[PDB]
């Protein structure tokens, strides 16, 4: 003698993929109430898998969309594809930049189509290609690939934290296990509406300005046995790294059309030295020791670090951006096994960059007048394991990049999106 | 206490379900689409509730007897040693049948009330 009874508001969820609101402080992310609220879920064990999470694809798409929307209205640099006459710079008026900066004279279109103006600019050698084997004939790197658009002066390059908030009828489960490795059961789970603030920082070899592991170093990978899968190493103690460019640039403008203004480097005012990043040797030694000890738990061989095997400038050197300058730093003093005192790493600056492969085609970053000085925290390392032969007594790990999703999987590994199903049917004595 | 009774037995979870019910410029396309989808889902659930005569109720009682082939567990076992997720997983194959039975019962009730008030 039992009858059906209908309950609305049953705590039952199912795995689902949806679009999530973007909060801060065609495409727009401007809600201003990121005030979090957390509810623990007692006696609930939930399965997590960070490598099958749609939040990373959503973040990829959102960052690409924001980048494209920012560069929509400002200057196109199609006249710059002109044959350049480049000679050695005259800077007479650890190392100097006389071998990296070239003084290029060319012709450009004025705001009247009938007259051309002969102008000059200082370009970095990484942004120029030589047309003839022995000659002074030079062109830009991107003229055979795409059309470049100037980074508009009002664009700010610093990251802003982004919160992801599930719409009504959904929830974000958060795994609070302090030694979580991204896959498996979680016995201490909480529920939230908006994730914690995540900064879309772009880097290649060392993860910067991120969160720290609560207890110990975490090694994460989709498949350890597959040497083609990158390894994310999340540290519990950040290492301070300070990068500077001591050269004093001059931001000078040329009117290249009816309202189109092109900014360039006139001359190097003084302090002729290469850009460099400073790091503390002892802290890096301790961090590397801890990483090696943690990795001994997964590989039963001696662990050594070697520099990247090869490739171009993009896939070999530590790329990052700050103040609006785009640095490529040579991390060979690190990842090579006195480490006393201060480690100084040389860096080179690039202006024509392609931050996202196939997105935005390319961007021209205008120079900044003053001396650039910048600080950051290393909170993670991306590594790649060289394919062994089964005979070597040691495994070689090299700092390597890859997809930029890895820069965000390290921040969204403890989140899951679920769909509420609030309609239950139960037998009860009522009628 | 949103979803706070997930790990609790249905005997205690059924108390104060209204927490879940309460929780249940230029805009982007995705934001507008999400809002419209949420409205549609709420309206669909309300349509199902209204079909059975449970329009504005959280704990709604019906007139369809419980068939033992749907689930033969004891009342104490159901309401004392299981959660909502496990129970809903167990009876997943009969939800569509029970929905149709509830709709038919409500229609029969309405027609019978009409006939009785005709007399």
């Amino acid at each position: 003698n039992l009858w059906v009874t209908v309950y609305y508001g049953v705590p039952v969820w199912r795995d689902a993929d949806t679009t999530l609101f973007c909060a801060s402080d065609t495409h727009a992310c401007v809600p201003t109430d990121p005030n979090p609220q957390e509810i623990p879920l007692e006696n609930v064990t939930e399965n997590f898998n960070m490598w099958k999470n749609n939040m990373v694809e959503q973040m990829q798409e959102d960052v690409i969309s924001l980048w494209d929307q920012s560069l929509k209205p400002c200057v196109k640099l199609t006249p710059l594809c002109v044959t350049l006459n480049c000679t050695k710079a005259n800077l007479t008026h650890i190392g100097n930049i006389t071998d990296e900066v070239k003084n290029c004279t060319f012709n450009m279109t004025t705001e009247i189509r009938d007259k051309q103006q002969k102008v000059h600019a200082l370009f970095y050698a990484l942004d120029i290609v030589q047309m003839k084997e022995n000659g002074s004939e030079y062109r830009l790197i991107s003229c055979n690939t795409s059309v470049i658009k100037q980074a508009c002066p009002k664009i700010s390059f610093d990251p802003i934290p982004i919160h992801y908030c599930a719409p009504a009828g959904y929830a974000i489960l958060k795994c609070n296990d302090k030694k979580f490795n991204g896959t498996g059961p979680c016995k201490n789970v909480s529920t939230v509406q908006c994730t914690h603030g995540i900064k879309p920082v772009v880097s290649t070899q060392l993860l910067l300005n991120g969160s720290l592991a609560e207890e110990e170093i975490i090694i994460r990978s989709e498949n350890l046995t597959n040497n083609a899968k990158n390894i994310i190493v999340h540290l519990n103690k950040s290492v301070s790294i300070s990068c500077t460019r001591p050269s004093n640039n001059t931001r000078t403008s040329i009117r290249i059309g009816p309202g189109q203004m092109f900014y360039r480097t006139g001359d190097i005012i003084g302090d002729i030295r290469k850009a460099y990043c400073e790091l503390n040797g002892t802290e890096w030694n301790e961090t590397l020791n801890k990483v090696t000890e943690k990795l001994k738990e997964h590989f039963n061989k001696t662990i050594v670090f070697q520099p990247p095997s090869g490739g171009d400038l993009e896939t070999t050197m530590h790329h990052f951006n700050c103040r609006g300058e785009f640095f490529y730093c040579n991390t060979t003093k690190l990842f090579n096994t006195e480490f006393n005192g201060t480690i100084i790493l040389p860096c080179r600056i690039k202006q024509i960059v392609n931050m996202w492969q196939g997105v935005g085609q390319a961007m021209y970053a205008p120079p900044i007048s003053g001396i650039i000085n910048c600080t950051s925290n290393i909170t993670g390392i991306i590594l790649t394991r060289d394919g062994g032969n089964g005979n070597t007594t040691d495994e070689t790990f090299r700092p390597g990049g890859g997809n930029i999703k890895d820069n965000w999987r390290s921040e969204l590994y403890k989140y899951k999106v679920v769909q509420i199903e609030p309609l239950g049917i139960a037998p009860t004595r009522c009628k | 206490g949103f979803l706070g009774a997930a790990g609790s037995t249905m005997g205690a979870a059924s108390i104060t379900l209204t927490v879940q019910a309460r929780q249940l410029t230029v805009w982007g396309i995705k934001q507008l689409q999400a809002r419209v989808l949420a409205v549609e889902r709420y309206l669909k659930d309300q349509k199902f509730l209204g079909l059975w005569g449970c329009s504005g109720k959280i704990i709604c009682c019906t007139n369809v007897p419980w068939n033992s082939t749907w689930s033969n567990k004891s009342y104490e076992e159901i309401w004392n040693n299981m959660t909502w997720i496990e129970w809903e997983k167990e009876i997943s194959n009969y939800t569509n049948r029970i929905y149709d039975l509830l709709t038919e019962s409500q229609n029969q009730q309405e027609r019978n009330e009409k006939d009785l008030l005709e007399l």
Partner: antibody
Amino acid sequence: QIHLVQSGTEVKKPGSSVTVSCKAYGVNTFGLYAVNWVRQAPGQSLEYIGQIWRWKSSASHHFRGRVLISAVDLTGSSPPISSLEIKDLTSDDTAVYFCTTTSTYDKWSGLHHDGVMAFSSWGQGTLISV
Amino acid sequence: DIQMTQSPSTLSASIGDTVRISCRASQSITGNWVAWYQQRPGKAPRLLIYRGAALLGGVPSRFSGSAAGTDFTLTIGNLQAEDFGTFYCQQYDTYPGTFGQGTKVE
């Protein structure tokens, strides 16, 4: 692409103990996959021996105290491993032992019911003669 | 401790026929917690049906299942050569799981 590879045939004497291994190619981790060990006597039906699930090991009543089940997760050189240890063998234990894995990631899936499970993938089986 | 029995211990058929196999349980399983397996001689058994009437990836659409209380049925239509050997029947509603005695086809 779940391939389960098991050890070879072994011939033993009563009173001894045996160990059977199972390498799970394609299984990302045992935190999402449950491992079940079953028995098949020659000419009879399948019998369930034990399981490891969420790093908890269990055996049936007929085998408690004489079967020990262990497992280790993905390492740098080998896939996930599971292993049976059988103590105090008798003439009735001669059979083919099977290692099986079933996914547990989807909580709503019909392949498992609160620990007692179906067996989606099967190994080639090890023949043990005593 | 549910014990399941299969009635047609031995069967015979020709290519293109249709075969029905039945399992009876000592208790009603209202959750349809029944699985159907196939085993060819000298090979590991293969799982074909779970939840009474659900197919797997790669299993042909010819196989079908029905579940009702204590009676479960496996139906094979347009029988081919590959569908030979011993068919097994398992429950996983209670602990421990239990298998059937198997039915020989072909």
